[model samples]
Target: KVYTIDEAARTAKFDETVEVHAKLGIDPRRSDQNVRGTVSLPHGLGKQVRVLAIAKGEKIKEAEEAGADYVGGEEIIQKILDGWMDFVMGAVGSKLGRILGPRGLNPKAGTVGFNIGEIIREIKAGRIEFRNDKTGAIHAPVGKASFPPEKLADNIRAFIRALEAHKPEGAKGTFLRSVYVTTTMGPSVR
Candidate 1:
């Protein structure tokens, strides 16, 4: 309790997103007090935050070209089932929103609102950031085997960069706790 707030704030390992810790009372680990906050950083993070599309009709191609790393099916029955992409862009119904909302995919479902290009434009400008699922793991794409050799290598390399924050501080021998390259229709890595 002796350290000043500004003192704690200024000491960050990874930019100012380094927030000062909280609570001298209870356990956020065991309780609901951990809370959630979504602040748009006007200064930018120099990041490429990928969005996912779990939508139908026009929203599919709309998302891919606009820069979603993952979209599901030719018919589109996707979910953030694997936390690969940062946001979920599309409709949510009784079962949809009820499920995705809790997953914290930052779903953009609403009553009377929305558009694609505007959202995509904003997203490409780094409007979103990767977040781990409530548990503690994130699974996303790292390009694919069919990519050019360097492109494939580049994907894995950059992927680890994205994966760093999960165990970022005082990181050890392995930044990636686990690594797997998969496809929606793969015959396994064998």
Candidate 2:
């Protein structure tokens, strides 16, 4: 039940992508999954997502019209600064890099757009976050292998689709240079 970081990292590299499968003690539908959340993948999530932008004043109305989940101006920024904001889609690296950056909630490229309203919708619909490393690597969650094999496979497919869709055009060398999948304490399943 013990796995070294190198082994886990190697297992992750096997797929040219990494998928972390957890062996849950209870059913995912039993509600504990909601409280006992686990982030096996620090790279990104396994689904496509929409985003909602919350503008201020007139912009708020426009953002809402554009389908923003929430809207406000200084109030919104204050809330975010005070740690009240839950979801975020800042203007480029400004809003995110300034406020949410330290919190690890900073949204990176390839996950969602900068549109406040649009990005909000995506967050509500299940858009996960992801970022590239200094070496140009991207990571994301597939699913727990403990689930039905088909379910796990489906999760992997969804992740792949999203990852490919967000591949940066300006990225040098191989865009998707590598990938892998594995469990926390178990050996590589692939």
Candidate 3:
């Protein structure tokens, strides 16, 4: 029998988490419509995330102290330009265009924004990345396998709220086409 959204949350064991997917109305091909952002999970994702910080000068030490897996500048850029990447990472500067976008060697290009170390620390502390693809689908991890079923449902609700708030400016009509939740190895329920 098909389960409702809440009932589906109880179908998985403690060690097998679920993946949340959303189909949006934005077109990635259009310059102003690529869907992307970050979400800080309330219960935190029970996993380890390694972050590489590309910087020069003060930001280098700052990033290192914040527990960045790797921190550097030109050498890291050269490595990316020479056709290899150790981490799909972050930073802000020129020459980054060579590595932006899903087709590039370094996919997740981001600004340290106001505070680099603080953001890196949050990412390490279970802040998750949420982005939609050319197909207009956003895939995000809601929570871990062991969470209370209510927790998973809560995550889903929160993520949908975030998605709604970030709908692209160019997107029109019904922004969320459909959504589903599923574990790595189990039947998916809406």
Candidate 4:
């Protein structure tokens, strides 16, 4: 029972963020079946993304010029460890090793890079990263309900497309078992 974006948007009385929930046909117990990736939404999610660029030397200047909200080296890292979680996203340069590394927030997933400029730009421009949970389900926000129906639809389609593109090799049968869309406090529409 597929429902149109128009119908889904109508159910939300307030301008709540729209979310897409997908249940995949992969066994989460298997390491190889884990799915993780990022997608750039065409219409952009209706939320401001704060970027924290941790770098040194020339890279610090690059991060600043690229529009990073907070740019620093060891000082910022120390701040983060002090329980200051203000930034929504992050980009790392070398030797952020123990802080972000041991926590499994490795830059190997494209967040850690020499191209601090490009990474910060992409994230600030509405690129979002997501992964399936233990239940093999992925929940991603498309946009706010205040957006036009077509714009909401555009983000939803882009998300599904990215999911398909990142299908795990270990996944068999139907990769996406089911999908549902809804607003923050609205009922789900399958």
Best-fitting candidate, measured by lDDT?
3
**Clash statistics: count for each candidate:** 0, 24, 0, 1
Candidate 4 lDDT over residue span 1-190, tens digit each:
2433434444554333444443345443554333333333344444443445555544565465454454666655445554434323444546555446326423333343345334345444333233222232342322222243453453454344334445344544433322234433333233
Lowest summed lDDT over 10 consecutive residues: which window, candidate 1?
Answer: 181-190
Which residue window of length 10 is worst by lDDT in model 4? 139-148
Ranking by lDDT: 3, 4, 2, 1
Residue 131 lDDT, candidate 2, scale 0-100: 23
- Give the TM-score ranking, best first: 4, 3, 1, 2
lDDT of each: 0.32, 0.34, 0.42, 0.41
- Better candidate by TM-score, 1 or 4: 4
Kindly report the root-mean-square deviation of model 1 from the true structure over all alpha carbons. 15.4
For model 1, the stretches where C-alpha displacement exceeds 4 angstroms are: 1-24, 27-34, 73-190
Q: How well does each candidate superpose onto the true structure, as a TM-score?
A: 0.34, 0.31, 0.52, 0.54
lDDT of 4: 0.41
lDDT of 2 by residue, 53-127 (tens): 434455644445334445455554545554535534534333344333334434442223354343234344223
Give stretches of model 3 more than 4 Å off. 1-7, 11-17, 26-32, 40-43, 57-61, 79-88, 93-106, 116-153, 159-163, 168-190
For candidate 3, give the lDDT of residue 141: 27
